[PDB]
Design an enzyme around this catalytic site. Sequence first.
Site, short mmCIF file in Angstrom:
data_model
loop_
_atom_site.label_atom_id
_atom_site.label_comp_id
_atom_site.label_asym_id
_atom_site.label_seq_id
_atom_site.Cartn_x
_atom_site.Cartn_y
_atom_site.Cartn_z
N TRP A 1 43.11 48.91 33.28
CA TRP A 1 42.43 48.81 35.05
C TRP A 1 43.47 49.49 35.60
O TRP A 1 44.75 48.84 35.98
CB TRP A 1 42.21 47.65 35.12
CG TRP A 1 41.77 47.57 36.85
CD1 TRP A 1 42.42 47.55 37.89
CD2 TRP A 1 40.24 47.89 37.32
NE1 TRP A 1 41.66 47.89 38.91
CE2 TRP A 1 40.49 48.15 38.92
CE3 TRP A 1 39.01 48.16 36.53
CZ2 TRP A 1 39.24 48.29 39.54
CZ3 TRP A 1 38.07 48.36 37.41
CH2 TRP A 1 37.94 48.46 38.95
N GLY B 1 35.57 42.52 41.32
CA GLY B 1 36.12 41.14 41.77
C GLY B 1 35.70 41.08 43.31
O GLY B 1 34.99 42.18 43.85
N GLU C 1 33.74 37.27 38.71
CA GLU C 1 34.83 36.78 38.96
C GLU C 1 34.70 35.51 39.82
O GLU C 1 34.70 35.61 41.13
CB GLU C 1 36.00 37.47 39.06
CG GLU C 1 36.11 38.67 38.21
CD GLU C 1 37.04 39.62 38.68
OE1 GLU C 1 37.91 39.51 39.25
OE2 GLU C 1 36.99 40.90 38.22
#
Length: 342
Positions: A323, A75, A117
Amino acid sequence: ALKVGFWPAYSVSEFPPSKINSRLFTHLYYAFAELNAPTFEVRVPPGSEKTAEDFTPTVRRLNPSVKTLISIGGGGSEVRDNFAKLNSDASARQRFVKSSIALARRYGFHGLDLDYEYPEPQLEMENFVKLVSELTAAIREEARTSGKPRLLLTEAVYFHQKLFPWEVVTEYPVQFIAAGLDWVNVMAYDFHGSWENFTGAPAALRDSKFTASVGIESFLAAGMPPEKLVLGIPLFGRSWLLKNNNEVGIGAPAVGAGPVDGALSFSEIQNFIRGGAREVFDTTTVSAYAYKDNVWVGYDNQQSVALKVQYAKEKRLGGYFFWSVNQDIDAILPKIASDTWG
Ligand SMILES: CC(=O)N[C@@H]1[C@@H](O)[C@H](O[C@@H]2O[C@H](CO)[C@@H](O[C@@H]3O[C@H](CO)[C@@H](O)[C@H](O)[C@H]3NC(C)=O)[C@H](O)[C@H]2NC(C)=O)[C@@H](CO)O[C@H]1O
Ligand SMILES: CC(=O)N[C@@H]1[C@@H](O)[C@H](O[C@@H]2O[C@H](CO)[C@@H](O)[C@H](O)[C@H]2NC(C)=O)[C@@H](CO)O[C@H]1O
């Protein structure tokens, strides 16, 4: 039945791979290899070569049947920028594809994952399609030339099939994905957090449009084979500072991020509770929260994880992922999840 866990390399000093209870997983991911612009010769961060090499032999010692994948990207804006630059350049895509396959083989991983992302707007989805199609083909070619089983290929996806549900600029091509990938990891969390001035359930199974079930429904309605979806469950919570200490439920007014910068590991949430915070199960959202004085955190607990995993089974999904595994040091939630599916 896919039981997936992500181990982030940043955590090595406090949670080395040897601490992962690999008995509770079928697949463990190393997060993350870097894109390494401008050459796009994909690599683990220089200096972490030994950690990357040792990861797979280490985790397999406790459960030899466990397989591993290495995730590329992550990310954040820098990764997204790099993917966008990469995917528009045919020569760069070729270098990325060749180096990523070589990387997985070099460290003894059984597969590759892409964490991008996000592939939006439309141009970015179109170019990502080019990258992934080329990667799928090269993976099959490498299997042919080496004689080894083909590398697994997965990717992280937004909770919803549409990017984004409130304003659609593009969407995940589900038939394309089902043909090219072994599964996708559905990031069914971060629905709510300190960016809002009210408390909420950050990974609500149901409720609102921002829920795990609505997201899963969207992929299935688009035509994704259910076995290609792996439901993400966070091992961290989102935290707020309360405006008033006597308003402590869901929807209570807030004044900013709680510790630590709005995120708290499950293990730290357990410490929070043992130190006097009150835990509440919210049946409406299928989630938990805990509060003490002006601190409020929403997260998944033993009950909500069991319910989410049973949900995944009911929906005929490929499995679930966590996660990230360093955030539950005693593997409380991975244990419940494994027991639930079994
Ligand atoms: C598949 C998935 O869930 N993807 C996204 C997650 O990667 C992301 O979790 C965050 O990941 C980053 C990178 O691993 C973490 O940042 C690191 O944090 C440590 C500790 O604070 C720090 O030492 C590192 O410098 C820092 N690295 C980088 C590159 O920034 C971050 O802690 C993770 N956050 C959480 C809550 O686990 C989540 C959340 O942003 O989003 C997913 O989509
Ligand atoms: C137009 C608008 O207000 N959209 C909101 C979204 O920004 C918001 O998405 C969330 O934004 C956070 C801050 O950037 C992210 O940390 C989080 O990942 C993201 N979550 C999702 C599911 O996209 C959503 C959800 O709170 O609300 C919209 O109203």
